[PDB]
């Protein structure tokens, strides 16, 4: 839930 959010947002934000 909130446990997965930070890493998921990190991964989704990647551009290179």
């Amino acid at each position, epitope marked *: 839930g909130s446990a997965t959010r*930070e890493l998921d947002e*990190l*991964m989704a934000s990647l551009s290179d």
Partner: antibody
Amino acid sequence: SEVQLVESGGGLVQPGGSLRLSCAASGFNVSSYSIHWVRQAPGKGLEWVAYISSSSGYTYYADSVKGRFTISADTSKNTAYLQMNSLRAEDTAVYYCARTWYYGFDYWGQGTLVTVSS
Amino acid sequence: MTQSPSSLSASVGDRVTITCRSVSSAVAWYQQKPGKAPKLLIYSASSLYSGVPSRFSGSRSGTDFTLTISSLQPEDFATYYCQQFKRQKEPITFGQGTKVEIKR
């Protein structure tokens, strides 16, 4: 033990061949936590290789496997998969799946050995 | 890429601080013993994972992340790994293992 990750589908394959690993999750929903595959060659360190959010569908691969491996999940079987094509000797390792826990992986499967040889 | 773990000799009771060798947002620390899955010690730089002994701690200073074992016991001799998270490829990377062995 309440959360668990159980892997299977490992074993032997030849260079150029393909294998499919499974990661069966219990005690949590795969749509609530992202899942990773991590591997380790005999006597070597841990190498992160792939990531999947089952809910969003977002996937990411390490360049060492990009174009050859596909990560996926079946939320109805609560299972993640790693499809490995065009295998090489250097893909020989113990493959683990592991669950996201903030900045960290909390639960890890037992590992399944993959040996790529002729 | 990847490689064999480096080695550190220590006596039971010693204090050990490992430094995680492109700047990282966060770091996690793992312990692994032969034939076993890695075990999470510290997540998000400094949070002690549930059930890990309090002699294990993690800390950030500037861009340098450390794990400290305040006083080693026999069961702590094992291989340790830092995991870097960063907003750039590769986003998740495990550092070289650090194998803490018993000084005899």
